[PDB]
């Protein structure tokens, strides 16, 4: 949310923890995959649906066939205008959807975490949670894979909240 | 303090920008250009098949055997045909080539010919064939004339009435071409042909023409006040073609068998050959690519990306990447 | 434990799949196919109006009254016209039908005719009408000829000069058709017509033609070396048409009044009639549907969904439904 | 979120409660309606905007009119390509919007509830809330129609939280 | 109670509605109409350049100098040309204007002419020029005839053979027009022209025609049974044009130099001029606007918004605004 | 969420506070700006991409050129249909995106605030937060510009929660 992780080389979306055991990055396997599967077929669908073109031609006319020639010319400009127009608005529209597709997926990671540790952590309002409790590497792995036990740190979180 | 976990996303040093309906010039992490913009600047084969380069010759110059087009006396199979915009070696007598553009368009579904002798030049026993020559049509400086077509004239003071016919004994359509000479005045008419009132009469199952020479005074084109019109038809497998004339007939000697019929067109390039290959060729160069779009040239030939007039088509695939 | 409330959505056993720009083959709860794919395989009426089936007859065979087209001697109103690709009963003498395709296209805004006798066959007192017959045009084995048009020949040894004219006294445009006979040689010309040099001359307010027979030797088409060209014009309400000829004239007897002018076309179907109805018909069958798209056939007629070349157009309406 | 309710025949979106009085499904009337109104006119708009076509024709040419004929042929292939292309990308794009339209509407139901009972229930992270308190059928009806009284169960929720 | 903060958005009294794929008639706070619907109902200049209004005259009437078109004897430069659907002052003798529509289309890239005397009317010393007059072509009641073209007839009982030629000494293409008179019978032919068998013969580098008058009986159009066909060609800078005839020749006096070549068209309006300006004009009125679309008229000319057949194109810019 | 602020003339999105010092509206400068920048270029992109048209023509045919004339006519109806179709579906689609663009931006303001004052305020479920604490004008300015200090009012909020 404050920007991207220059340091996350492992994937498109993921985590960054810091604790007494140190720090580290960790990409989400499922989320990054889902995004690539989605984005790539988007590209292909745009490319593959274009299967239309096969034949190609110019065309030749004499001096007493200027109406027909102009008719031919306007047919080509006609379809060119339409096809230019489509491709450009296809890209703009779809590029936008791609970009907030990523925003939506990042938000989903943030929410999966926020649900697992309600009052066990402080929402810093920055993309990060300040855990109330001590969260060792295994506690951190646990919040990443969904397999995080809330009640273990329950009163610890409550009691160290109550320090404030 | 306290321990922390954060949710975040990829960043890099990529500078590829991308557009949106609400935002312009948005830096992205990964992207795909789909607009192809490069070509090899050369004319190439299609699918291992060379094209037919008439260099300074036109389709008419080639088919009627203009003396300067001899290099195309017996060409082999071709993928497409390339002609210049204003070939120097077209007709050598001024005149009309009837339904030229339709003939030209017919060579767009044709791939290969076989020049056949249809009525030999040495058969014209009672007419003077070899004087079918003029200064308007040079060869090697010397006065010459089309090679595929005979300009008959009178022998003694006699142009007897010609009556010849040809039964296509083959299984291919064949392309026959003939012509008519519009002389300048009664005197020229008599000196060339003897008979003052004349006609060419050509007939197939489908064709029924009768051409009468327009004897009049004209402005000299290539220092020549005369004119010469040409004509063509397709002769189906078991059909016969009949000619009759008593003057001003420009008879055929050679016809063209059509084998084979496929895809082609007629490119108006000045660009030279390059010993390359492509499935997509344009007048200004071939393109060996793989992309849904290009902006090279409208007049494209083969299986080619959609020509578009955009400068940029780039799809964002990755993430917003600002430092 | 403790009480619970949950937020959820519909599911079912539906197996209808649906596509997306990012996902293919996504099972859904409810959907709408909009692409129509079925047709009744038959040719049907449009809006309670039967079409005009010329069975083995062509438009020319029908309008000129080819002897094998008698079933169309006096047809009634029609919605469209169906012709085969290669009708066996076209012209019976080989030759050109001038501006055929334009005539054909004119029958696409026409809905009904009224065959009128325009100059009776029994009026030709000084010419031999009834010998207007040939083996090239069979009927019931016997040598016959077009019924709507007279092939005049000399009576005694005399083809006097014909001068006839017709003032359209009606309020409808009427379609008149006539022809010219190109004979084979001077001998045939004299035996049929007497006069060696001849012409047909036809004039309206808009038309001014003069046709001269091309006397030449030809290849036999249907065992017949001769040729016969036909012509047509529209004669406006108070205009008159003038004919003049001294030979080779194929005069009209019957003309066609145009009533009425509406929508039509000319379908090239082999399919038979089926006593059905539709507002949309194709060459390979009618379609009684209601959908924005179809993929049946390009050449469609009436008010018909947009022909498209997709195999599937299905709109998701309900929810993602995986078990 | 874990999947759809094979058991909800009453509508497109809705609820499932379980309590001491038993269990049951219950569809949201407003939400299901809004979705049908939306989705159906989407379909019609696609269909009705097509009002364009009226006339129909082939066309006929002789042997010395091959340029014109080809011109005619390419006009038809030309418009066919464009119209095929549109219809297919119209469907893909719009089918996607339809699908996450439904996701968005479901999320709205989940949020309407979550706001009414903050700490009176546990977000299981599964689409369901485990009420802290006892929630009789009328308490459940109350959370469905928005007319739910938070303060009634306030300290009950707090006190039975404090059991943990 | 307790203090409060709220998140909210703009509202107003705006009643502008806007559409959506799922919702119709949605009231919005701010919007932009992009469909232009208004026009000034007049014909105006383009870019400070007036058009060429032939009022009741047609392009042919104007170029051949029909006596009622005198106001266009020497027009200046123009932006476009406006003609009525059925101009009362077209040809004054019935007949064909060969390749009319191609001529018309040529005036669509032309912007200005310069009427030049090409062969003076007083040069015809041996033929009677001034009797080139008829009742079919009135002027001021009096029998007159086209002004830009001479209808030559015999002097004494003699129509000697005409042989005249013109070498375009200019650097502009020039447009030349001539004609042929189809008489009614042998008697008229002799009385007008003397010679019974005649021809017009016209030649350039590109052109080679020979016209023979069709002598026949016709229906009276404008109380006149005769006919008169016209013809035209472009004569390139250093080319010469040759005429030869011994009868029925409608010779040129004036030709048209082309300067300059630009954009134009030929509008079929009944609307009058209005002393206005626009970069976009339609037949039913000009439009001074700035919007990507309009629904005024299909046949538009200039740089104009995309004609569309929608009644409403409005983009929501602001927020949903219900009270 | 209950509707728009007839009273907010300052911008597109913003706030309304009420406290002991009285009440007032206040538009978000950044958010309103971002929306105008976005919406306006959307309009221009639609308009500017149309750069295609330049030349214009009718065309003229005789009585024996009805096939060509009809061909010309169908080319014009052909492109007209396509261009009409595009413009109409461009507007519908894009107008929809514009409208929930605004909904999304409003939601972002609501969330920026909700993160800053978790249990210091009650989510009324109406777009408004009832602060637990007393929030003077400067406290209010502070929540608008992100520069709001949570811990100041921490126990005040807790203690006056505990009145319930
Ligand atoms: C998370 O731990 C679970 C068990 O609690 C395990 O199945 C899973 O593989 C772990 N995730 C990763 C990414 O290793
Ligand atoms: C919910 O109860 C309210 C009153 O608290 C009532 O007006 C409403 O009808 C109830 N909802 C349903 C679906 O019956
Ligand atoms: C909000 O206050 C900060 C300092 O806390 C200040 O920099 C900013 O200008 C204030 N916002 C406004 C809109 O005045
Ligand atoms: C040669 O062609 C003619 C057409 O004139 C055809 O009838 C005939 O079958 C061919 N020759 C022979 C001997 O069959
Ligand atoms: C018959 O048509 C002619 C055209 O030749 C027209 O002038 C005339 O009015 C019609 N007949 C009569 C008696 O009016
Ligand atoms: C006049 O035109 C002729 C074409 O006939 C051209 O050859 C010639 O150059 C021009 N006249 C002169 C004197 O050069």
Residue numbers in the entry:
A (entry chain B), D (entry chain B), F (entry chain B): 10 to 173
B (entry chain A), C (entry chain A), E (entry chain A): -1 to 321
Copy text verbatim from the article accompanying this structure deposition.
Furthermore, N-carbohydrates were observed attached to the conserved Asn154 in the HA2 of both Hubei10 and Anhui05. N-carbohydrates attached to Asn154 of Viet04 and Anhui05 mask the vicinal Sb-equivalent antigenic structures from immune recognition and represent an additional factor affecting antigenic variation among these viruses. Anhui05 and Hubei10 displayed more straight-forward two-way patterns wherein 8-fold or greater reduction in cross-reactivity was measured. While Anhui05 and Hubei10 both bound to α2–3 glycans in a comparable, but weaker profile to Viet04, Egypt10 revealed a much-reduced binding profile to α2–3 glycans, with the strongest signals coming from sulfated (#5–8) and fucosylated (#30–34) α2–3 sialosides. Asp94Asn (present in Anhui05, Egypt10, Hubei10) and Met227Ile (present in Hubei10) are both located at a distance from the RBS and have been implicated in enhanced receptor specificity for α2–6 sialosides and enhanced viral infectivity of Viet04 in mammalian cells. Thus, despite these HAs having a number of changes that were previously reported to increase viral attachment to human-type receptors, the combinations of these changes in Anhui05, Hubei10 and Egypt10 do not appear to increase binding to human-type (α2–6) sialic acid linkages under these experimental conditions.
Herein, we report the antigenic properties, receptor-binding specificities, and crystal structures of hemagglutinins of three different H5N1 clades responsible for recent fatal human infections in geographically distinct areas: A/Egypt/N03072/2010 (Egypt10, clade 2.2.1), A/Hubei/1/2010 (Hubei10, clade 2.3.2.1) and A/Anhui/1/2005 (Anhui05, clade 2.3.4). The overall structures of the three H5 HAs are similar to that of Viet04, comprising a trimer of HA0 protomers, each with a globular head containing the receptor-binding site (RBS), a vestigial esterase domain, and a membrane-proximal domain with its distinctive, central helical stalk and HA1/HA2 cleavage site. Highly conserved residues (Tyr91, Trp149, His179, and Tyr191) formed the base of the sialic acid binding pocket, surrounded by three highly-conserved structural elements: a 190-helix, a 220-loop, and a 130-loop.
